[PDB]
Motif scaffolding. Structure first.
Motif, PDB file in Angstrom:
ATOM      1  N   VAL A   1       0.797  -1.212   0.000  1.00 36.74           N
ATOM      2  CA  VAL A   1       0.000   0.000   0.000  1.00 36.74           C
ATOM      3  C   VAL A   1       0.840   1.278   0.000  1.00 36.74           C
ATOM      4  O   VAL A   1       1.734   1.472   0.847  1.00 36.74           O
ATOM      5  N   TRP A   2       0.543   2.148  -0.961  1.00 40.00           N
ATOM      6  CA  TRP A   2       1.149   3.464  -1.032  1.00 40.00           C
ATOM      7  C   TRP A   2       0.049   4.518  -0.970  1.00 40.00           C
ATOM      8  O   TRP A   2      -0.992   4.387  -1.638  1.00 40.00           O
ATOM      9  N   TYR A   3       0.289   5.566  -0.183  1.00 43.13           N
ATOM     10  CA  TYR A   3      -0.629   6.682  -0.110  1.00 43.13           C
ATOM     11  C   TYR A   3      -0.053   7.806  -0.949  1.00 43.13           C
ATOM     12  O   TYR A   3       1.162   7.997  -0.979  1.00 43.13           O
ATOM     13  N   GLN A   4      -0.928   8.528  -1.643  1.00 43.81           N
ATOM     14  CA  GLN A   4      -0.517   9.662  -2.442  1.00 43.81           C
ATOM     15  C   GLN A   4      -0.358  10.874  -1.547  1.00 43.81           C
ATOM     16  O   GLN A   4      -1.326  11.456  -1.090  1.00 43.81           O
ATOM     17  N   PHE A   5       0.885  11.246  -1.296  1.00 44.45           N
ATOM     18  CA  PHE A   5       1.174  12.377  -0.425  1.00 44.45           C
ATOM     19  C   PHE A   5       0.976  13.706  -1.164  1.00 44.45           C
ATOM     20  O   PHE A   5       0.385  14.641  -0.625  1.00 44.45           O
ATOM     21  N   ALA A   6       1.467  13.777  -2.397  1.00 44.46           N
ATOM     22  CA  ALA A   6       1.310  14.971  -3.231  1.00 44.46           C
ATOM     23  C   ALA A   6       1.446  14.623  -4.708  1.00 44.46           C
ATOM     24  O   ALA A   6       2.092  13.622  -5.064  1.00 44.46           O
ATOM     25  N   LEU A   7       0.821  15.431  -5.561  1.00 45.70           N
ATOM     26  CA  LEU A   7       1.030  15.344  -7.015  1.00 45.70           C
ATOM     27  C   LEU A   7       1.010  16.702  -7.740  1.00 45.70           C
ATOM     28  O   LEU A   7       0.461  17.685  -7.247  1.00 45.70           O
ATOM     29  N   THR A   8       1.598  16.742  -8.931  1.00 48.61           N
ATOM     30  CA  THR A   8       1.437  17.910  -9.779  1.00 48.61           C
ATOM     31  C   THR A   8       0.099  17.810 -10.506  1.00 48.61           C
ATOM     32  O   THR A   8      -0.486  16.728 -10.604  1.00 48.61           O
ATOM     33  N   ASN A   9      -0.378  18.941 -11.001  1.00 47.90           N
ATOM     34  CA  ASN A   9      -1.700  19.064 -11.598  1.00 47.90           C
ATOM     35  C   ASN A   9      -2.022  17.887 -12.519  1.00 47.90           C
ATOM     36  O   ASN A   9      -1.223  17.540 -13.378  1.00 47.90           O
ATOM     37  N   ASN A  10      -3.191  17.282 -12.359  1.00 46.21           N
ATOM     38  CA  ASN A  10      -3.482  16.050 -13.085  1.00 46.21           C
ATOM     39  C   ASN A  10      -4.944  15.951 -13.513  1.00 46.21           C
ATOM     40  O   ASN A  10      -5.822  15.727 -12.681  1.00 46.21           O
ATOM     41  N   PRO A  11      -5.203  16.090 -14.821  1.00 46.78           N
ATOM     42  CA  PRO A  11      -6.568  16.067 -15.333  1.00 46.78           C
ATOM     43  C   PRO A  11      -7.189  14.681 -15.390  1.00 46.78           C
ATOM     44  O   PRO A  11      -8.378  14.569 -15.696  1.00 46.78           O
ATOM     45  N   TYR A  12      -6.410  13.639 -15.108  1.00 50.65           N
ATOM     46  CA  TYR A  12      -6.924  12.267 -15.223  1.00 50.65           C
ATOM     47  C   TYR A  12      -7.292  11.628 -13.895  1.00 50.65           C
ATOM     48  O   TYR A  12      -7.904  10.569 -13.865  1.00 50.65           O
ATOM     49  N   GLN A  13      -6.900  12.260 -12.801  1.00 53.36           N
ATOM     50  CA  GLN A  13      -7.136  11.701 -11.489  1.00 53.36           C
ATOM     51  C   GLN A  13      -8.580  11.900 -11.052  1.00 53.36           C
ATOM     52  O   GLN A  13      -9.048  13.032 -10.943  1.00 53.36           O
ATOM     53  N   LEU A  14      -9.292  10.807 -10.798  1.00 53.75           N
ATOM     54  CA  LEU A  14     -10.682  10.930 -10.352  1.00 53.75           C
ATOM     55  C   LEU A  14     -10.827  10.850  -8.834  1.00 53.75           C
ATOM     56  O   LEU A  14     -11.840  11.255  -8.274  1.00 53.75           O
ATOM     57  N   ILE A  15      -9.802  10.335  -8.167  1.00 56.23           N
ATOM     58  CA  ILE A  15      -9.839  10.218  -6.718  1.00 56.23           C
ATOM     59  C   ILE A  15      -9.170  11.427  -6.097  1.00 56.23           C
ATOM     60  O   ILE A  15      -7.956  11.610  -6.221  1.00 56.23           O
ATOM     61  N   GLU A  16      -9.969  12.257  -5.435  1.00 60.28           N
ATOM     62  CA  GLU A  16      -9.474  13.527  -4.921  1.00 60.28           C
ATOM     63  C   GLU A  16      -8.739  13.388  -3.589  1.00 60.28           C
ATOM     64  O   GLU A  16      -7.633  13.887  -3.435  1.00 60.28           O
TER      65      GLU A  16
ATOM     66  N   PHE B   1       2.018  -7.873  -6.786  1.00 60.17           N
ATOM     67  CA  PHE B   1       3.059  -8.241  -7.759  1.00 60.17           C
ATOM     68  C   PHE B   1       2.986  -9.732  -8.153  1.00 60.17           C
ATOM     69  O   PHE B   1       2.874 -10.606  -7.288  1.00 60.17           O
ATOM     70  N   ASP B   2       3.045 -10.013  -9.457  1.00 60.37           N
ATOM     71  CA  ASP B   2       2.949 -11.392  -9.951  1.00 60.37           C
ATOM     72  C   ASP B   2       4.316 -11.974 -10.351  1.00 60.37           C
ATOM     73  O   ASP B   2       4.397 -13.065 -10.917  1.00 60.37           O
ATOM     74  N   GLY B   3       5.385 -11.241 -10.044  1.00 65.29           N
ATOM     75  CA  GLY B   3       6.738 -11.675 -10.382  1.00 65.29           C
ATOM     76  C   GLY B   3       7.284 -10.897 -11.561  1.00 65.29           C
ATOM     77  O   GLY B   3       8.492 -10.895 -11.818  1.00 65.29           O
ATOM     78  N   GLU B   4       6.384 -10.230 -12.295  1.00 62.91           N
ATOM     79  CA  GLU B   4       6.819  -9.376 -13.401  1.00 62.91           C
ATOM     80  C   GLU B   4       5.997  -8.074 -13.524  1.00 62.91           C
ATOM     81  O   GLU B   4       6.597  -6.971 -13.637  1.00 62.91           O
ATOM     82  N   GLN B   5       4.652  -8.155 -13.475  1.00 63.32           N
ATOM     83  CA  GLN B   5       3.846  -6.905 -13.513  1.00 63.32           C
ATOM     84  C   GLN B   5       3.156  -6.633 -12.174  1.00 63.32           C
ATOM     85  O   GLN B   5       3.165  -7.482 -11.291  1.00 63.32           O
ATOM     86  N   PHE B   6       2.558  -5.423 -12.026  1.00 63.77           N
ATOM     87  CA  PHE B   6       1.720  -5.141 -10.868  1.00 63.77           C
ATOM     88  C   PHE B   6       0.268  -4.972 -11.274  1.00 63.77           C
ATOM     89  O   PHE B   6      -0.029  -4.438 -12.347  1.00 63.77           O
ATOM     90  N   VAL B   7      -0.630  -5.404 -10.395  1.00 61.62           N
ATOM     91  CA  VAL B   7      -2.024  -5.033 -10.482  1.00 61.62           C
ATOM     92  C   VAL B   7      -2.260  -4.081  -9.328  1.00 61.62           C
ATOM     93  O   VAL B   7      -1.674  -4.241  -8.260  1.00 61.62           O
ATOM     94  N   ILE B   8      -3.120  -3.093  -9.540  1.00 57.62           N
ATOM     95  CA  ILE B   8      -3.354  -2.066  -8.536  1.00 57.62           C
ATOM     96  C   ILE B   8      -4.842  -1.871  -8.235  1.00 57.62           C
ATOM     97  O   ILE B   8      -5.670  -1.901  -9.137  1.00 57.62           O
ATOM     98  N   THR B   9      -5.161  -1.628  -6.966  1.00 62.71           N
ATOM     99  CA  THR B   9      -6.482  -1.146  -6.586  1.00 62.71           C
ATOM    100  C   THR B   9      -6.312   0.212  -5.920  1.00 62.71           C
ATOM    101  O   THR B   9      -5.631   0.330  -4.900  1.00 62.71           O
ATOM    102  N   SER B  10      -6.912   1.240  -6.509  1.00 67.17           N
ATOM    103  CA  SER B  10      -6.798   2.577  -5.967  1.00 67.17           C
ATOM    104  C   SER B  10      -8.135   2.998  -5.397  1.00 67.17           C
ATOM    105  O   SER B  10      -9.172   2.796  -6.028  1.00 67.17           O
ATOM    106  N   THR B  11      -8.115   3.560  -4.194  1.00 68.41           N
ATOM    107  CA  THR B  11      -9.354   3.971  -3.535  1.00 68.41           C
ATOM    108  C   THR B  11      -9.239   5.350  -2.903  1.00 68.41           C
ATOM    109  O   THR B  11      -8.141   5.863  -2.692  1.00 68.41           O
TER     110      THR B  11
ATOM    111  N   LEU C   1     -17.213   7.614  -2.201  1.00 68.92           N
ATOM    112  CA  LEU C   1     -16.224   6.550  -2.321  1.00 68.92           C
ATOM    113  C   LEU C   1     -16.021   6.157  -3.779  1.00 68.92           C
ATOM    114  O   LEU C   1     -16.987   6.052  -4.536  1.00 68.92           O
ATOM    115  N   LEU C   2     -14.768   5.940  -4.168  1.00 70.49           N
ATOM    116  CA  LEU C   2     -14.461   5.506  -5.524  1.00 70.49           C
ATOM    117  C   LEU C   2     -13.297   4.525  -5.556  1.00 70.49           C
ATOM    118  O   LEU C   2     -12.299   4.696  -4.850  1.00 70.49           O
ATOM    119  N   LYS C   3     -13.434   3.503  -6.394  1.00 68.66           N
ATOM    120  CA  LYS C   3     -12.382   2.517  -6.601  1.00 68.66           C
ATOM    121  C   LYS C   3     -11.986   2.476  -8.075  1.00 68.66           C
ATOM    122  O   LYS C   3     -12.840   2.371  -8.956  1.00 68.66           O
TER     123      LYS C   3
END
Ligand code: NA
Ligand code: NA
Ligand code: NA
Lengths: 181, 181
Positions: A34-49, A58-68, A76-78
């Protein structure tokens, strides 16, 4: 052009991708969790405020992510995402989300246990580019020692660090509910 | 506030995408071919200005794509691309290029042998969308009856078709050298 401050002159900066990729790959595993978003630069694609909480598996090569978190409407948004090696053999990852696209993502620096500084950059055909940056933390808060690491990192490729906006995190967040989706 | 023609107030129009996988789906499978970009709407990402030739070949579930033509700097350029189903199983495709990103893409309409009308749109969080539209032909030329087909298809999802710019194609193009890469 009075706007926007995410479009920037010149082409995407050189970040020594091969080096980062060489350093990070043997540790790729400790990027999971788990990583929390501490800060970001302006982002028109982010739906989670607010309360942005990113769950990485991690599957040994790629990551799958759940963002909430809480969307811009106060609800609430996932969002599901993925993080995998460039599909063309470039030394960087693609970050891809539903109802969104896939962008290059580089990790400029991370210790895996406290913080990570993320960089996405896209070149236009008219000699400009737009980029999008993030400071990730393992906690709702991040120590000044670590914020200072990302600052140097982003100054080092001339991202204007005044562009960062702090994300709402902490006790007011329903992390407990966010976990269950 | 000088605003690009390709950033438009509002959300991406709803195309019934499921209807497009019903129509616009061919009786028999097309495994290989080449299309030429007849015209497109203003696009800050497209690095090939002239003679845009798109060769595709099928493997597994992704079309491998080779895009060639003359770049804005006057030099010949080749770009590698991939076309696959949206990885989150959204009813549309991802078009993915080397040194760029993966955008969503739908075939608004085609007849598989003369023309194809393509559309990519994405929503921003500050109340705008960007969309990017393409008319393809199997030759440099395209009868006006097919152009009319694409125009209606685009007008039907509220795309100002006065945004289209014809792409330089014809015997002035170094297609042959393009074929060699
Ligand atoms: Na930004
Ligand atoms: Na954590
Ligand atoms: Na095949």
């Amino acid at each position: 052009d009075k706007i926007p401050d995410f479009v920037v002159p010149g082409k995407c900066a050189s970040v020594t991708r091969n080096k980062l990729w060489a350093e990070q790959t043997p540790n790729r595993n400790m990027y999971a969790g788990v990583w929390y978003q501490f800060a970001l630069t302006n982002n028109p694609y982010q739906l989670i405020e607010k309360c942005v909480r990113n769950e990485y598996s991690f599957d040994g090569e790629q990551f799958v992510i759940t963002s909430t978190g809480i969307a811009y409407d106060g609800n609430l948004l996932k969002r599901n995402g993925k993080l995998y090696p460039n599909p063309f053999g470039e030394p960087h990852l693609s970050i891809d989300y539903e109802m969104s696209f896939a962008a290059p993502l580089v990790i400029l620096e991370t210790d895996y246990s406290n913080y990570a500084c993320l960089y996405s950059c896209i070149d236009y055909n008219f000699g400009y580019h737009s980029d999008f940056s993030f400071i990730f933390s393992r906690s709702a808060n991040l120590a000044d020692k670590y914020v200072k690491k990302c600052e140097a990192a982003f100054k080092n490729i001339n991202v204007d660090t005044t562009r960062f906006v702090k994300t709402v995190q902490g006790s007011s967040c329903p992390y407990d509910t966010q976990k269950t989706v």
